[PDB]
Amino acid sequence: ADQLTEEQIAEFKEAFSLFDKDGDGTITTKELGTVMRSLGQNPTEAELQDMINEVDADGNGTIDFPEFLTMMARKMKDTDSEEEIREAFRVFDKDGNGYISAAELRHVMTNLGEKLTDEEVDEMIREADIDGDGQVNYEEFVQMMTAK
């Protein structure tokens, strides 16, 4: 049996809220670069359309809600997320102090069309803020990413 309430849908929507400006159920191949441009790394025009082909639901570059995360959910353990534990630390760390604040984080995601501000989101850091610096430490990565 499978059940998804407002708790499992918000974490499933949290990923769709970035690649979709209004959340119509389908995202453009151009939004990926909008998230990658936020990740700091973003590929060329055709190199980004190749990311939707990994699942090829419509083979047009557009993808639905249950179709994008499916081929991407099996690719988390189909590689090595340990080498990745340091990457999210290398990406998020703007000043390289060991803690990344949410104040800059959502202003960062805001270039996509967020309904949340870089400031008001900081109420969220409290979920991964184990060091209490109002930012995320190196200790929260292994807890949230390794222990899902």
Binding site: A10, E14, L39, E54, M72, M76, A88, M145
Partner: peptide
């Protein structure tokens, strides 16, 4: 993945492609 854990993991999946 719940609120800020999923937003962090989404960054991990967008780079492993």
């Amino acid at each position: 993945k719940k609120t800020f854990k999923e937003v962090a993991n989404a960054v991990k999946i967008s780079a492993s492609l």
